[PDB]
């Protein structure tokens, strides 16, 4: 369930970030910012919400949604999204949809670590977390 993601979570690990960075249209410069970062993501339970903060030396972001409900997203890379989150299983699946284009991130826990799968068409990221 949700509960299981409530944490806080500190970046060790990214596979493939750069390319998916690409893809999505974020310049050289901002690339290489991106792939050193290390971001904290905390997230909780508030009500019928669910947030997501996500704390770093780049830029910091909130969302806070309803599962299953359309919301306006303003990303880090200041993309203006119609974003859906839903739990699917155990997993917890975010749309994001901007400008006739799509992306999804897939959150898992597994062995105790937070894995964040990344799709952009045919371009695959993943980042792992662990509960700090």
Known sequence: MVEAFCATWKLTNSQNFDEYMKAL???????QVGNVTKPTVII??????????????????EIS????????????DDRNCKSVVSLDGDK????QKWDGKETNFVREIK?????????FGDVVAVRHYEKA
Do not use: C, P
């Open 65 to 76: 949604f309803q599962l299953g409900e359309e919301f306006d997203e303003t990303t880090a």
């Open 92 to 95: 917890l699946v975010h749309i």
């Open 44 to 61: 909780s339970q508030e009500g019928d919400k669910v947030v997501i903060r996500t704390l770093s030396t780049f830029k910091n972001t």
């Open 111 to 119: 062995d105790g670590k937070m894995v964040m799968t990344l799709t």
């Open 25 to 31: 249209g974020v310049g050289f410069a901002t690339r």
